[PDB]
Design a protein around this ligand. Sequence first.
Ligand code: CLA
Ligand code: CLA
Ligand code: CLA
Ligand code: CLA
Ligand SMILES: CC1=C(/C=C/C(C)=C/C=C/C(C)=C/C=C/C=C(C)/C=C/C=C(C)/C=C/C2=C(C)CCCC2(C)C)C(C)(C)CCC1
Ligand code: SF4
Ligand code: SF4
Lengths: 158, 33, 733, 80, 68, 68
Amino acid sequence: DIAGLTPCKDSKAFAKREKQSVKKLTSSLKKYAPDSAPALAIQATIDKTKRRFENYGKFGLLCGSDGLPHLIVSGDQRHWGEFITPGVLFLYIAGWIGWVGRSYLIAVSGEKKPAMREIIIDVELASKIIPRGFIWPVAAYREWINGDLVVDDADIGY
Amino acid sequence: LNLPSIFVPLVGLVFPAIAMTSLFLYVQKNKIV
Amino acid sequence: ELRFPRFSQGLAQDPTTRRIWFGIATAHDFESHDDITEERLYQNIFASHFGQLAIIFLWTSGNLFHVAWQGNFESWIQDPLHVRPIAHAIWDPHFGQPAVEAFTRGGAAGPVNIAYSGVYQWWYTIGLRTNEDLYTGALFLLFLSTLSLVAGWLHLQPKWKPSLSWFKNAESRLNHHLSGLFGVSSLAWTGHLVHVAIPASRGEYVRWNNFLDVLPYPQGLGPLLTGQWNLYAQNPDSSNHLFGTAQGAGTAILTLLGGFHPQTQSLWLTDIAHHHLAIAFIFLIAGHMYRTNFGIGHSIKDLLEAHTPPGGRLGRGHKGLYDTINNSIHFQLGLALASLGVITSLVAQHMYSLPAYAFIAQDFTTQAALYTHHQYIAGFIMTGAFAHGAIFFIRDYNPEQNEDNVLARMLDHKEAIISHLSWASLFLGFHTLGLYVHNDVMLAFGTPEKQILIEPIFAQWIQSAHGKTTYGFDILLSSTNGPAFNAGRSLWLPGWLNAVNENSNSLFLTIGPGDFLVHHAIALGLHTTTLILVKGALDARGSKLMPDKKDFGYSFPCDGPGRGGTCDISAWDAFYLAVFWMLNTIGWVTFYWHWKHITLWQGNVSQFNESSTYLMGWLRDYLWLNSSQLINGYNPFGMNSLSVWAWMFLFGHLVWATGFMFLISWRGYWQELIETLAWAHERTPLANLIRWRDKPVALSIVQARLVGLAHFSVGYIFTYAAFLIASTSGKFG
Amino acid sequence: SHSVKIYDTCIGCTQCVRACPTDVLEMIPWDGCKAKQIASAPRTEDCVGCKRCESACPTDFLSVRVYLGPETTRSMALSY
Amino acid sequence: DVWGTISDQGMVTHITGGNFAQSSITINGWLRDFLWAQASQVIQSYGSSLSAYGLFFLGAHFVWAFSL
Amino acid sequence: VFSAHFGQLSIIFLWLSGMYFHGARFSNYEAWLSDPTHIGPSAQVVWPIVGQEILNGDVGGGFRGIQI
Ligand code: CLA
Ligand code: CLA
Ligand code: CLA
Ligand code: CLA
Ligand SMILES: CC1=C(/C=C/C(C)=C/C=C/C(C)=C/C=C/C=C(C)/C=C/C=C(C)/C=C/C2=C(C)CCCC2(C)C)C(C)(C)CCC1
Ligand code: SF4
Ligand code: SF4
């Protein structure tokens, strides 16, 4: 397939690795009583391992000659679940955090001693600003349009 | 004759002695003119 | 002029040992000497450059003489794959008999050293065959080294001193150096290849006593004058040619084959000849651009004054840069050092993938040594470029005469520049270290299938574009029906494609996720080193913490404990900090090169492909595994030929560590201690009859930084050199 | 010997003179400030270059400046 | 010289087999027979119950270099 | 000084209480009492998330955990 890689659901090395891990777990499982707690924990680990391999196989990942999954990040539409969609989620969350921080700093700077409100948080004020990160992409865009996001170079100084 | 047997001591022992002697006497001069 | 140093009265009146140290350290800083003028600076520089040429010629002549006197070049010529070349004989009276036995190698009758510089392959490729030729070369170089000294002495006499305006004729110097130093030299070397080396690669011996009679080509210069140049290519060497012999030999002198010679695994000689001929042409044309005395040629100042964007986004453009550059020698040194560092790295990268010397590709230790050596030299040159660039801003830059040009606007948006460099460094560091740690944890918990492994798709795509077929991409030169494939299908594509798709050589190696990770680490190193050096250069004249820094010069200790404290505030200190990061980055580069090649040469690529994705793999499978022979050079049971390298290994670890002492503990501790020892000596009988004449004191702050960094660098280099040479030559020779 | 200089932003607070450990500086009459006095450095052959005077100065930027120069017995503080 | 196993006949086998006397008198001996030889357990611990010690080994090298 | 020393003693007692409780609740001390030379002491166990349960090693006596 892409870059000489093979789908993990059809890779012999992938199945070999799964079998080796399951055998290694079963060798430890064969040391305890069937109804003891360690046996149940090892059995749960075995079931989890089988589920992990099955999900990797059926989610469309690609495997190399080593028998391990590899990620594709060039933009191909068959692999957006690997980088692009989680990346959009990361950007959304990070923008929320940054936007609420900047809005708190701007709202608090008008007081007599703003620094006192930076080592002791005003939770009453922050609890009104936290929910507003929900629409940060709209607010930031509108603020950029109207020229409220950036300070002119002439005005920057201590 | 074995040339290394003569030249290794001259470069490793005697030449450094002469050079260091001259440099020590040069840096100690009270006046150079 | 009172005493040593004669060139500095301020140092000459110093009554302490500080007079001596500093006297040595400021000897070659001519600009700072007493009663110096502008003209004497240039003249003394000219004499010193002649001195450097004389020393270089002496070094080369010594190499030739010692190889001829004590080497086995003639024996090596006949069996180049199983004979080890000899550098020089050993005469050490401290040796014991087992060492005498162990170091006797290469067919010699005494203990010897094996050469790893590669001079045997080089000198065999250019047509040398006997010890008499080597002796004549050494004598000729001895003559040139004397010529350099005589010329330096002559041009320093009152009748023969050039004036100040002679040294500032930029157009004439550029013309002479482009046309004559580059182009004509290339022409002469092409002539050597046609008349000497290529015939030597076919069994014909041409020397100074018979070269007039023998013809380099059967039809002579007729095809050149008439224009039937294609006759110089039509009978190339056979694929079964034996390099020193006439079996399978051809008659062409200028070809466009590409690929490698099947036996020697190096580039064809006719390709090198045609290359140097075309390059010589290009430089000969390039050297006619500027105006000297004949009413034609461009003017550099008028070229600079014209290229100004009309929108005003670049201020006044390049107006005033001609005088700014031509009146500052530090600006010139910075430009030259930057260019030379870039091409040193380019030489290192191109000599491992496209070998040019016969039988050098099979000598693994030599190739490793050359790549590592030239990369470290390149790193030092790159740091020096920014150092002298920073010196420019303090000593020579004139604000009034650079008003609103590009150089001033660089100083104008320094905060933006530095902040964006910092952001890039932070991003690369966070995410690269995070991926490595995630993979390490996945390996530790026994679930290697949960690693994050990013395929280097863009680099594989470019490799496919260059002709590689490994990844199944069908693009450009990797496709069969396209304009690019068709255009070169008959010229050089067959040999080039044969070379690229052979997986035994080092031409476009196959790459994977480990390569992705290590390349992003190398990028981190480049960006951070650049951040440090650029911040040093752009803040040299001052900042908010020290707005008048330019009054204090390039190197000074500090500005005291006030205003919060000001340790390491000068530009010299920024250079000092950047050298550490340079060593780190070059270490990463050379580690990666060595491990990938060592697994290639053993036929075990999967070892690298699987162990390189986590850092414990690097620690265990590269460092720990490849030391076993090295640390057994001597042991309680005996010693072998690696003993010297083993000794050197420990020597390195020592010097490195000693440097820490100068870097961590500072001066005030040591001065107080020294006072007590002075008291003790003045009070001891039979010894107070002896008196010092320079009062002993502790080292200066800047001096200590320098000494510590020097011990650090020497130890670094010696340790890695011992490991590299021992590990490779223990396995392959 | 080091060089010490005084600039005309001085407000005549006298802190630098009090801070000096070898008596380099002193106050003299002036008419350019509200305190009617200004600092002076007449004995710089005894300066060691400690920069306590710079640490004491309140103006921005400094009004007293020290440039380290050629070293002597007095400026290296050698008792032997 | 002390720790080890003993057989039924009373033959003491030491963990490193009495190499201290001859090998500890050079620096190369400390480097080869002590650090390099005995680091094998900690560097081979991945995939077992002792892998936490390998992880801490690497992390502590990191912190040490960070202090510089 | 007196009051701060009392605080330090309180913290030390908390540490000892934790040690004895973890010995009583999550250890193989009783099994170790019957075969000291063959069983490895253990009094720390981990929860099964993100695969860290591999650290519960086979120390003996029907118990899995971290050796102390
Ligand atoms: C055609 C006339 C001519 C020539 C041949 C030269 C030659 C030279 N001049 Mg110049 N010069 C000239 C005219 C000329 N000049 C004129 C007219 C003026 C007055 C305007 C000057 C003013 C002048 C000054 C003021 C200075 C020089 C200097 C120099 C020297 C530079 C150092 C050197 O050797 O670089 C050698 C460079 C090369 C061989 C070319 C670079 C090659 C690169 C690195 C690529 C190599 C590729 C290759 C394949 C690698 C092979 C490696 C090998 C191991 C196999 C050099 C000897 C300097 C000097 O040192 O003087 C003593 C110096 O300071 N010149
Ligand atoms: C073509 C190359 C070139 C040239 C002509 C110059 C010329 C100059 N440089 Mg520049 N420089 C260069 C390359 C060059 N540089 C490079 C590559 C670097 C980066 C490392 C620098 C970094 C640099 C700095 C940081 C400074 C200069 C300065 C100077 C001045 C001379 C200072 C002096 O007398 O030092 C005297 C020389 C010494 C005291 C010797 C130092 C040797 C070091 C410590 C290492 C020695 C270790 C030794 C080999 C150990 C051997 C051990 C054994 C067991 C193997 C002069 C204008 C100074 C300047 O202009 O200040 C305003 C200055 O401060 N240069
Ligand atoms: C588990 C996954 C993971 C983790 C733990 C991290 C962790 C981190 N990321 Mg990262 N990242 C991830 C996945 C992850 N990333 C993925 C999948 C992507 C692909 C989209 C990125 C892309 C990414 C970027 C582009 C950046 C980071 C940065 C960071 C660091 C600072 C975040 C911060 O302070 O936000 C709190 C938020 C703020 C302080 C506000 C400003 C920064 C955020 C990112 C908002 C940016 C808004 C802007 C309009 C988006 C486009 C920018 C453009 C340059 C692409 C932090 C260590 C930042 C960094 O390294 O900075 C040096 C950074 O710039 N990450
Ligand atoms: C291994 C040693 C080491 C490390 C890790 C660093 C790291 C860094 N150096 Mg430093 N440096 C070192 C050695 C090191 N340096 C040495 C020996 C020198 C020579 C004196 C210098 C000289 C130097 C200079 C002069 C500069 C740097 C800069 C930097 C930064 C580069 C950008 C980067 O990667 O950001 C990413 C950050 C990191 C990788 C740091 C670690 C982040 C951790 C892992 C995050 C998680 C922390 C964890 C949760 C905390 C738990 C602890 C506690 C709460 C319980 C970074 C902070 C440059 C800088 O500041 O750029 C902005 C810079 O200018 N370094
Ligand atoms: C600070 C300072 C300084 C310094 C500087 C420096 C040191 C710099 C560096 C820089 C650098 C170091 C740079 C580099 C660059 C590079 C580049 C820019 C490149 C490019 C390339 C290209 C473009 C290519 C292309 C291609 C390809 C890839 C393929 C084939 C084809 C072609 C050829 C097209 C000075 C002296 C000025 C003075 C002032 C201040
Ligand atoms: S540097 Fe020290 S000794 Fe010199 S004037 Fe200032 S306070 Fe006095
Ligand atoms: S401390 Fe500064 S302002 Fe005060 S007297 Fe001295 S120089 Fe003037």
